Target: Endoglucanase
Amino acid sequence: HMKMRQPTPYSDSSLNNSPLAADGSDFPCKLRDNAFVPPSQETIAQIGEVMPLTFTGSATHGGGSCQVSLTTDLKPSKDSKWMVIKSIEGGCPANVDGNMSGGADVPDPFEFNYTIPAGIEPGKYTLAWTWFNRIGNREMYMNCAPITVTAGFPAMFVANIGCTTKEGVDIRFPDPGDVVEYDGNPSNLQPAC
Ligand SMILES: *[C@@H]1O[C@H](CO)[C@@H](O)[C@H](O)[C@H]1NC(C)=O
Ligand SMILES: [Cu+2]
Model:
């Protein structure tokens, strides 16, 4: 149970910590009433700029693995095409064995980053954070945010909503892309579905 804090998600006031529905019904982005209201301030990412990726919550489930992906759709649906720009294998959204202190609203002390690479054209996108928790039920977490790319790829991995991950491991994505980061404990890294 975690949510993305930066970049600021769509409709943050109605966005909870829960994973995607196990039946796939609310993929992508936790579909619900008024799910795609932009935050007030524009999130601007210059090509090549190191951008923050940060989280809220204490139920870190021993970490796991995450992707950062972009689509041109501003109200994503099941038909949206995603482009993975970063994979984090292990230690996302935290490198601890289990859960952390502080309740549902605590800023997660482990912080991350992403960079818009040269092959992404300036324009408006939706950015998705996806997360496959290491410990607990086999879930997929997902939050989405509007971003504007200014001047200054693999498809997104989907599982746990026939492709089912193994409890206890930090998964390694089949096609993680050319920007892959390992932030976890070597003993938990997958020797994906
Ligand atoms: C982005 O985060 C990774 C993982 O902590 C770190 O290794 C890297 O140095 C960071 N990049 C920066 C701060 O430019
Ligand atoms: Cu949880």
